[PDB]
Design an enzyme around this catalytic site. Structure first.
Site, short mmCIF file in Angstrom:
data_model
loop_
_atom_site.label_atom_id
_atom_site.label_comp_id
_atom_site.label_asym_id
_atom_site.label_seq_id
_atom_site.Cartn_x
_atom_site.Cartn_y
_atom_site.Cartn_z
N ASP A 490 6.55 -1.37 5.26
CA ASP A 490 5.92 -0.44 6.20
C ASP A 490 5.52 -1.07 7.54
O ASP A 490 5.24 -0.35 8.50
CB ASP A 490 4.67 0.18 5.57
O1 LIG Z 1 -0.44 3.10 5.34
C1 LIG Z 1 -0.05 2.20 4.30
C2 LIG Z 1 0.41 0.87 4.86
O2 LIG Z 1 -0.62 0.40 5.77
C3 LIG Z 1 -0.28 -0.85 6.39
O3 LIG Z 1 -1.29 -1.17 7.29
C4 LIG Z 1 -0.15 -1.95 5.33
O4 LIG Z 1 0.21 -3.18 5.95
C5 LIG Z 1 0.91 -1.56 4.29
O5 LIG Z 1 0.91 -2.49 3.22
C6 LIG Z 1 0.65 -0.15 3.74
O6 LIG Z 1 1.77 0.26 2.97
#
Ligand SMILES: OC[C@H]1O[C@@H](O)[C@H](O)[C@@H](O)[C@@H]1O
Ligand SMILES: OC[C@H]1O[C@@H](O)[C@H](O)[C@@H](O)[C@@H]1O
Lengths: 822, 822
Positions: A490
């Site tokens: 992500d």
């Molecule tokens: O919104 C969910 C995502 O937020 C990001 O800030 C994180 O680094 C990810 O690990 C997560 O999947």
């Protein structure tokens, strides 16, 4: 060191001190009602949706942490203490907390009075039951008053925490000191209006007193640890009107030496048909019929024990599908109990609510829930089947889909981003795993709508073609699939270029144009596209099937021609076509995701584990050397030390944490599996142990979080906190690790027409027996494992050798005995 | 029952005990940087936007309330206490908190050591300064160590409280023990990425030690009241890495009897141009140039004192425009100090952040800020001018407008709803008030865009025409304005019909169709439409003006013909065309809004206060009888006892709270003004006293909230908590009450070409003098008031008699002596 120990016979983890490095919790419930319970009675409960139907309040980042939950204040001659230690923190003669499957026991003893509490959510019930046993351990008769306590939440957790300008005036309750089975308090905020539900908090005895207003119970200027009412030794019988509603009953107990008494408390969620909501014509009194029935179902200790026994039988049956007996008890413990238990939790919770995920913005992720299915299909296939249908119903006609959907409504939303190009293919992954497990090919014929639209139904298989076609029609200049918002990672946002603080990289509008491609989606396509092809062939689509495998071949070729950096696979190409994850760059030279997934897809696999010429071998060697640490494999190396505007969120994390140099446990099992594919079982098993709970229990003061479940990330090298975990419980590493150990290390994995037995765990587990129920038959797999590097198994079935490692499925009710020699 | 008292000479409210009914706060800052400071040092600080640039963390609904803020732990030979009482709650020999204008002083003394702290935001500075004075009040030498403490927030308040899965790994700090003026701690979370700002927390001396990690400072299982570091007696010199960053310095002091020492602490907000962000080429160390300069401007007590005196002069100047001297010290106190102080606060905060509004969902309200202008234009007209421009820029071409805009970016959003049809007319109200006050007709020529679109600029006046035409072109079957989402009353949602729980009535989309009409907007239109006509005529738009006046006459005709229930004004027509607020219904018979506003608009006004046949008199008589309580006037009667699906949110509140039977103080001044219009000054003044702070101080135990500022709502007669207030500080009640008392009761109000002097306050204030600076001239208005009902004033100016009650503006620099006789 350790703060407890596993009790395998009892299927529980025993915490021997309230002084753990961090609050360690358990999840109660496995159907529609859930409860988060720490070893200090901390947490909260909710019905189906932690955001829209939270019954009780819980404060994240409180000082101290977890200073609120289900409390029982004991006043013995003026001395007030709580068996859960917090919030009072009185010195206890004894203390123990046992987290079991669907229930927990917390016991505290002080000055001749022992108080044990059994916490659990009964099967078929939307409630949390507490069975309290108070025992006089002295040689003289004792008396005391017990004050129960629970703080209600105003259903909408988000509103509850931010909209006081309105909600401080809407809190409403009802008091029933003389009910059919005892005393009960009703929390009915907004029942007056649009809610057809209310909560009840009662006890199986006529309480001496009660309290529903928090401020009165606790007292001005006081914390929960200094609550006035318990200290005074008498309830104030407060009737709330707005502000903060609570549930509390005072019960006077008398005990002869060695004598004990049981009290049963119930926190229930009730609903009434709109036309039966009120007991009066004036519509001011809530209809308590369902509440009374519920309290009547838990009025005695016998009913509680009977329900607890059913829950035990329930878990014994669930865990009977896959089990192992070997020379490694840490391995057995994980495989037979904890990993599967956690897979049930992730299946039900996704990534919504834990002591890290706040149960507000995140619902059921498309990618997350599909993957959770991989480690859940063997437990309750029917629920997996329905989940697949719910997930696919939030897909769009063009193949893409909502990144997640709201638990309560089962409707997709963009609250945490949209357009993640890896999402589509995960649907194929979940369906394939399900068909292989159950053999229910009929699911492919199930009519499924697009975005829950009436009239848009098509067979589930069509949904899969849309997913498959979305990738084929969205490839870039190198023949690799375009990444879009991001892929599995992500934080790899190549179409973001954000310079505006505060705005989430997850939902900030991406830039049009560019040629950003993902090597990860390429391997993902090669892997699951092949499964799609198989599903099409079985349906008699030689045309569709033939074309599909051609595309898989094209992308596979693209990966070797354009996704190879020399010693490992490339990670991606950015908006400008610049390579990402290349040795040519100073930081982020190698990223783990493509290495594990490409080899899992068979890309670059040579003639053997010693074929130091094969790219798959070179890639894995690079992973071991550059990403390996005693706590697991870091995501990439080196970590980024300055903000790389073209890569998105990744470089915003200080080195060693989360996606920037942290050990993101979820992708470690991909390397584990990759190592088994290449034939290096010893190394695969090694990686497994580096991140598995049972093997890390001995360094609890370093891991800090729960020693019985996987967490999302462990601080990697480069971080001053190396070895320390965050975000425990809710993580796809649970499903992926069960996949890895059960299907690739131990080697027992379901295929479309048979059960393949292909051990590859190395020499540390010389012999073991796996008992696997599959397609209605029971397979007793006895393995004699040499662990020889690269050696694969040969089987003999029911007294006769067979060719290959795939045992055709035997008829239901059958019991086949396979002898494995590796 | 009081917990303090007013000190008029010092312009402060003195709180003599830490044991108040609820935390009582003061606001620091009047420009771009603000601090919420309670009498126990609780609260937080932010730069321009409480949601996007919050420097420090504050927990709403904590247990106990307000446990967290700027603390100074004193360790005197092992005994630890805090001068603010909380969080340690050690017995203090003396305690006192003084809330002044832009500053507050909190003093605590225990065992021979007195610690006084001056808190304030200096003019022209984005920081909160604390001047701490420690005095040895014993007869022997003393040695103690002082530990400062503040908990940082991760800038985005919403992210800080909900996104732990990410933010527990991003906290970053820098420590500078040997700085140019002393020691400092830098909180730089996300500075490595998109943020160009950081916070600094320093002291004007080289500290013995420091701490930047909360858990290390506080210790496991401990609350702030049990912090380990202070107890140990020395800092742990912790350097944070993720989790919870804090700012803390330790200073050991030795004082001989009677000796004292000063320490100056600074919490600051700093920004750097992108090219000047880092001190090193490697971009790892923040450039501290701006922070060093800031700390240098407050390195001495002399600098602090100079800044405090500057702040005092600033307020003396602001309060010199309007002031009164009468026989009533409570009235004078409100008019000369507190009501005006509060109007500056509402101007700056709108309804975003207080100890009730959470500083997250709400920004600058369109309706709210326009109305606040009514009580702020005389204070700083130049700033009111800009505000008008910023507000008008969020308006749409069709006349409608964003309901609010984000403070940091000045761009509107629909976060709290859309389509509130009363919004447009408030823009005319604000501009009219501003022109009457300043005579700055040029503002109508100021170019102003629609929805901040560059190139869409149009004269401000044209924006007013859009507002006017919106109402004209949006009237229902009775000729009354269509209500839309809701009118002034956010809870009168006649186009809602929601049956889905949990979804805000404010944001839930509405149903097209229906004929829902609002009598309130009708009155509002008559009142401000008339003003629009005047501005049009003054602009030379003869035809536009004629047309405008025609539309105004039609709307008022509809009010008397279709908006009159017989003994009071109707409230509205629902979606079905049925009347709302009629005696024909059992509940919600009479609503206060239209009663006060219609009369203010002159609708139904007769020959005099004795004309019992005039509808205006009947309406006000009905208000007094049916809505009157000793604590003010309730919104409607009777309150709704069951959910009325066609009315929206209103009936969702239990009877007696907020919009359902609560005393919504904001609409009381409209009835007050109405009364002065019909000539019943005595009754009007009576209503003023019922809700005014200075008059309710003697019942602080019932009001519970701050006794020096107005609150949004006081529990009504149908509430068990009748008399108890909620939502203090941020309310249009302040601006409207100042308008009422300064312009209608005392009777001195600005008009386009002259100053109106029309007293109508009754016999309780027989003689008083108002000093009013207007259009650069000073007016000394001496009033001899008999208070006889209906009696209007006659004037004499500088020795000569004048016609009517309007004194044409005299040239700037002159002093005009007006003798008034009533
Ligand atoms: O919104 C969910 C995502 O937020 C990001 O800030 C994180 O680094 C990810 O690990 C997560 O999947
Ligand atoms: O969004 C702001 C509005 O929220 C409503 O729930 C409240 O009843 C109103 O008083 C308030 O103005």
């Amino acid at each position: 060191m350790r703060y407890g120990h596993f009790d395998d016979a009892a299927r529980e983890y025993v915490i021997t001190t309230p002084h753990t490095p961090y609050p360690w919790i358990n999840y109660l419930g496995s159907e529609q009602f859930f409860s988060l319970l720490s070893h200090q009675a901390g947490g909260y409960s909710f019905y189906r949706d932690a955001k829209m139907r939270r019954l009780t309040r819980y404060r994240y980042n409180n000082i101290p942490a977890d200073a609120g939950g289900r409390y029982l204040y004991v006043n013995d001659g003026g001395d007030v203490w709580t068996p859960s230690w917090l919030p009072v923190k009185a010195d206890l003669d004894h203390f123990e907390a046992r987290h079991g499957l669907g229930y927990s026991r917390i016991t505290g003893e002080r000055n001749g009075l022992k108080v044990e509490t059994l916490f659990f959510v009964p099967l078929g019930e939307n409630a949390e039951v507490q069975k309290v046993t108070v025992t006089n351990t002295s040689d003289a008769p004792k008396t005391a008053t017990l004050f129960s306590f629970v703080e209600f939440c105003l259903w909408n957790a988000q509103d509850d925490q931010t909209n006081y300008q309105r909600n401080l005036s809407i809190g409403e309750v009802e008091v029933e000191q003389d009910g059919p089975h005892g005393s009960a308090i009703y929390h009915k905020t907004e029942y007056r209006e649009r809610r057809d539900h209310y909560a009840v908090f009662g006890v199986n005895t006529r309480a001496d007193g009660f309290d529903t207003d928090r401020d009165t119970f606790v007292g001005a200027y006081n914390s929960l640890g200094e609550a006035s009412v318990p200290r005074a030794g008498k309830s104030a019988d407060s009737v709330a009107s707005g502000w903060y509603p609570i549930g509390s009953h005072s019960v006077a107990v008398t005990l002869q030496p060695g004598e004990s008494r049981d009290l049963v408390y119930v926190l229930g969620y009730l609903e009434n048909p709109d036309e039966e909501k009120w007991a009066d014509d004036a519509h001011q009194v809530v209809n308590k019929a369902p509440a009374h029935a519920l309290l009547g179902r838990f009025a005695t200790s016998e009913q509680v024990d009977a329900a607890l026994e059913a829950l035990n039988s329930y878990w014994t049956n669930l865990l009977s599908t896959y089990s192992v007996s070997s020379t490694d008890e840490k391995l057995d413990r994980m495989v037979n109990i904890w990993n599967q238990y956690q897979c049930m939790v992730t299946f039900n919770m996704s990534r919504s609510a834990s002591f890290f995920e706040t149960g507000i913005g995140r619902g059921m992720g498309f990618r997350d829930s599909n993957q959770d299915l991989l480690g859940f299909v063997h437990l309750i296939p029917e629920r997996a089947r329905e989940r697949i249908i719910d997930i696919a119903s939030t897909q769009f006609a063009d193949g893409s889909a909502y990144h997640q959907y709201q638990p309560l409504t089962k409707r997709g939303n963009n609250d945490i981003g949209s357009g993640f190009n890896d999402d589509p293919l995960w649907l194929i992954a979940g369906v394939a795993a399900y068909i292989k497990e159950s053999g229910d090919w009929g699911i492919l014929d199930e009519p499924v709508p697009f975005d829950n639209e009436p009239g848009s139904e098509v067979p589930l298989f069509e949904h899969l073609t849309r997913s498959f076609q979305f990738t084929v029609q969205n490839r870039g200049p190198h023949g690799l699939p375009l990444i879009g918002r991001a892929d599995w990672n992500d934080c790899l946002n190549l179409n973001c270029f954000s310079t505006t603080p505060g705005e989430s990289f997850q939902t900030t509008e991406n830039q049009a144009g560019g040629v950003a491609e993902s090597v990860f989606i390429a391997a993902q396509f090669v892997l699951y596209g092949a499964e799609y092809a198989t599903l099409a062939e079985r349906r008699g689509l030689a045309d569709v099937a033939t074309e599909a495998r051609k595309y898989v071949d094209e992308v596979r070729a693209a990966v070797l021609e354009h996704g190879w950096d020399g010693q490992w696979f490339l990670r991606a190409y950015d908006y400008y076509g610049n390579p990402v994850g290349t040795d040519a760059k100073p930081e982020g030279k190698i990223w783990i995701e493509p290495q594990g997934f490409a080899v899992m897809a068979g890309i670059g696999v040579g003639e053997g584990p010693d074929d130091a010429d094969a790219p798959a071998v070179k890639a894995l060697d690079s992973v071991n050397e550059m990403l390996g640490t005693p706590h697991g494999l870091v995501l990439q190396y080196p970590a980024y030390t300055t903000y790389q505007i073209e890569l998105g969120e990744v470089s915003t994390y200080p080195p060693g944490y989360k996606e920037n140099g942290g050990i993101f446990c979820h992708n470690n099992p991909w390397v584990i599996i990759a190592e088994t594919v290449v034939g290096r079982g010893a190394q695969a098993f090694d990686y497994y142990k580096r991140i598995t709970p049972a093997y890390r229990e001995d360094i609890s003061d370093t891991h800090k979080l729960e020693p019985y479940v996987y967490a999302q990330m462990i601080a990697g090298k480069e971080a001053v906190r190396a070895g320390e975990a965050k975000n425990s419980w809710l993580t796809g590493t649970a499903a992926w690790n069960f996949v890895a150990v059960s299907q690739y290390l131990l080697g027992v994995r379901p295929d479309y027409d048979g059960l393949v037995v292909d051990p590859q765990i190395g020499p540390d587990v010389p012999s073991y027996t796996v008992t696997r129920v599959a397609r209605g038959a029971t397979y007793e797999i006895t393995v004699t494992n040499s662990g020889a590097p690269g050696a694969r198994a040969s089987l003999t079935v029911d007294g006769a050798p067979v060719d290959g490692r795939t045992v055709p499925y035997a008829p239901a009710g059958s019991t086949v005995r396979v002898e494995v020699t590796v």
